[PDB]
């Protein structure tokens, strides 16, 4: 998220068009964007088109125009002279394609090759007029979109939601590198800056969970400190742990400590889960998802979140504000946790309704106890306090003495309402976490750990995921192309040292030059047995599953594989909310809004037309009179309800009297005749 936020181009701001005043001619993708602004990555809301991401290879020239590299061809010979061109020069010349048949001597195989003319036309020009060629494929895709495997099989519409749902993952407690990546993880991780990189070559002296000592080659020594459980701007942990031992030797630029979402220097936003593609009992109906319970017991998906609470003892004109322990008119039990100063001891579970700070300010005893309490809906241990004091000559805000600040942390497991989602854009909300015994399990007893619907794949045109699934399995089980008597034809161009892989072998398929379909068929045709001489996935890639709930085998084979799915930051615990009676506004007596204060839902404008259309009148009257702003109606209905009486009649709404006063303020003699 940070790396993509630094490379952003926004067309809205001081001196630029506005979100509500942009036509449909500025949000499109002009044919001059090729290689200068990714056409896939873009927000989905009303900003679509006004915000974009700079491509991988682009640079900004001194005047501020965006330039891209091109490899120049002289006399049909593809040299290596890289020339940076802006839009105009690219317009003037003719440019070929990156993935063209080079004959190993910088010469095209056939005279005709796709090119881009002046105005973005695509045509066939003989291989004698070509003036430039793309340095490589992928040149049009930004950093986020370059990390989607099999991108060229997915429609743009779903690749967009795939590139906008990698910036919303959540650093899990333990991270794991994906089985099938795209070779772009390493560079993104190292550049994003969340990992620690040895500044100079040397040998490790001592390693510990807090710091690492490197003894450079020439006397000097350096100590790298580590961020342990530090809050980020959006409430996720920021751990860092070493990956080197006390005797290893490091080199300049080497990765020496993981980050929030890194695993040995590679981006790791999620986990590899065993996935089947059958519809199951309707629980995964309409994009829903089903998880096994193994993803709860073993903390496969378990996030850590940290909340910050602040309070300032203002000097005030009256003076004497102090953070004291003794809370006026308080019980002994509720004051038990607080330390001598009046700050909760670090290591106590402050569930909703406890004290964190004891603050009393003059009434203008004559004081008000604004003792900061855990707001509604929080819990978890207290992992860190920080108190700044005026007496310690700190840089405090003018007119205060103390700024005690507390942190509370909690581990959230996966549960109903979360928003798991793959990479290609197969978002869903966990529907039912079944126990580990009734899950479709393969012939050898391994239970599948997730289930996806078939009806969602073909219609949305994101077939890519299925391909990934297949490849995932080939990565997990490990294969061995049998070159006993000549290499098979489908593996002729397969690179060396890829004819065979050990189990749990990681592979990479670049975005636009990857694994062809024939290669996938060949790999699936040969795969090692698991423990005994059994193969669980036949050539088509589909296995035979036993139904755990009833016992009988499913009549037809099903697709199974390994897919890399994440956990999005739209958890349920931050969304659920209810209100019986709580705070009310001041100018108008309606209830407030938002989960923080207490909040009550809004019965909007076009939710009073449905009630009118139904013909229900009493419900509408009570939803607008004795539930929102009739001052006596509220207390009377509360009393009637607790005492079992029949609910009373409504009066008139306060906002109407506010309207009458506002009209009268304009010199309009409004009067309520009879």
């Amino acid at each position: 998220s940070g790396l993509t936020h630094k490379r952003r181009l926004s067309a809205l701001g001081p001196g630029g068009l506005s979100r509500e005043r942009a036509g449909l001619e500025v949000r499109d993708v002009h044919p001059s964007h090729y290689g200068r602004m990714c056409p896939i990555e873009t927000p989905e809301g009303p900003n679509i088109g006004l915000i974009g991401s700079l491509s991988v290879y682009a640079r900004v020239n001194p005047f501020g125009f965006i330039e891209t590299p091109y490899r120049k061809v002289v006399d049909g010979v593809v040299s290596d002279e890289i020339v940076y061109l802006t839009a105009d020069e690219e317009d003037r010349h003719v440019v070929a394609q990156a993935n063209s048949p080079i004959d190993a001597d910088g010469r095209f195989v056939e005279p005709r090759v796709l090119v881009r003319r002046k105005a973005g036309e695509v045509e066939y020009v003989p291989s004698s007029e070509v003036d430039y060629m793309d340095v490589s494929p992928r040149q049009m895709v930004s950093v986020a979109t370059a990390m989607i495997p099999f991108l060229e099989h997915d429609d743009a519409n779903r690749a967009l939601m795939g590139a906008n749902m990698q910036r919303q993952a959540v650093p899990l407690v333990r991270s794991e590198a994906p089985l099938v990546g795209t070779g772009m993880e390493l560079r993104a991780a190292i550049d994003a800056g969340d990992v620690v990189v040895a500044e100079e070559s040397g040998v490790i002296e001592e390693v510990s969970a807090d710091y690492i000592t490197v003894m450079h080659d020439n006397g000097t020594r350096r100590t790298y400190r580590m961020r342990k459980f530090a809050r980020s701007n959006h409430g996720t942990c920021a751990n860092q742990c070493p990956i080197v031992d006390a005797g290893d030797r490091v080199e300049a630029g080497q990765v020496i400590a993981d980050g929030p979402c890194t695993d040995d220097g590679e981006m790791a936003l999620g986990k590899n889960l065993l996935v089947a593609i059958m519809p199951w009992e309707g629980h995964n109906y309409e994009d829903a998802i089903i998880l096994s319970n193994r993803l709860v017991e073993e903390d496969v998906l378990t996030s850590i979140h940290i909340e910050e609470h602040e309070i300032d003892a203002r000097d005030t004109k009256l003076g004497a504000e102090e953070i004291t322990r003794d809370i006026p008119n308080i019980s002994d039990e509720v004051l038990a946790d607080l330390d001598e100063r009046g700050i909760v001891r670090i290591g106590a579970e402050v569930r909703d309704g406890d004290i964190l700070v004891g603050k009393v300010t003059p009434k203008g005893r004559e004081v008000r106890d604004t003792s900061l309490k855990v707001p509604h809906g929080e819990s978890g241990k207290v992992i860190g306090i920080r108190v700044f004091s005026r007496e310690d000559e700190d840089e405090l805000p003018a007119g205060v003495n103390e700024l005690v600040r507390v942190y509370v942390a909690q581990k959230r497991k996966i549960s109903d309402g979360d928003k798991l989602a793959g990479r290609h854009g197969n978002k869903g909300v966990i529907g039912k976490i079944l126990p580990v015994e009734d899950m479709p399990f393969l012939a050898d007893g391994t239970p599948v750990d997730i289930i996806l619907n078939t009806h969602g794949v073909p219609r949305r045109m994101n077939i890519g995921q299925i391909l990934e699934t297949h490849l995932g399995w080939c990565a997990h089980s490990g294969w061995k192309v049998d070159a006993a008597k000549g290499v098979p034809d489908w593996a002729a161009r397969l690179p060396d040292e890829l004819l065979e892989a050990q189990p749990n072998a990681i592979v990479s398929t670049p975005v636009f030059d990857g694994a062809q379909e024939a290669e996938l068929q060949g790999l699936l045709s040969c795969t090692l047995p698991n423990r005994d001489g059994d193969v669980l996935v036949d050539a088509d890639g589909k296995a035979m599953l036993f139904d755990g709930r009833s016992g009988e085998p499913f009549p037809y084979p099903v697709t199974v594989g390994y897919m890399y799915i994440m956990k999005l930051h739209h958890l349920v615990d931050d969304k659920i909310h209810a209100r019986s009676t709580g705070p009310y506004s001041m100018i108008t007596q309606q209830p407030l809004g938002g989960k923080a204060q207490f909040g009550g839902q809004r019965f909007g404008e076009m939710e009073c037309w449905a009630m009118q259309a139904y013909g229900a009148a009493y419900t509408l009257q009570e939803l607008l009179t004795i539930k929102s702003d009739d001052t006596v109606g509220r207390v009377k209905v509360y009393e009637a309800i607790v005492k079992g009486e029949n609910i009373p009649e409504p009066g008139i709404p306060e906002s109407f009297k506010v309207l009458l006063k506002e009209l009268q303020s304009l010199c309009l003699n409004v009067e309520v005749l009879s």
């Binding site: 790396l3 630094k6 490379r7 991988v56 290879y57 640079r59 590299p69 490899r71 290596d80 890289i82 990156a98 993935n99 080079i102 340095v135 490589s136 494929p137 950093v143 590198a177 990546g181 070779g183 390493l186 560079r187 993104a188 190292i190 550049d191 994003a192 800056g193 490091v250 080199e251 300049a252 630029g253 080497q254 990765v255 040995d264 220097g265 590679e266 161009r493 397969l494 690179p495 040292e497 890829l498 892989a501 072998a505 990681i506 592979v507 990479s508 398929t509 670049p510 030059d513 990857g514 694994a515 290669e519």
Partner: peptide, 26 residues
């Protein structure tokens, strides 16, 4: 690749890219 201690991640790529990716925060 070129990072001294990166994990060995094999690739299916057929082409070769003459130019390394520039500094992503440059």
């Amino acid at each position: 690749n070129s990072v001294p201690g990166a994990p060995n991640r094999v690739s299916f790529a057929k082409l070769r890219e003459p130019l390394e990716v520039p500094g992503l925060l440059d």
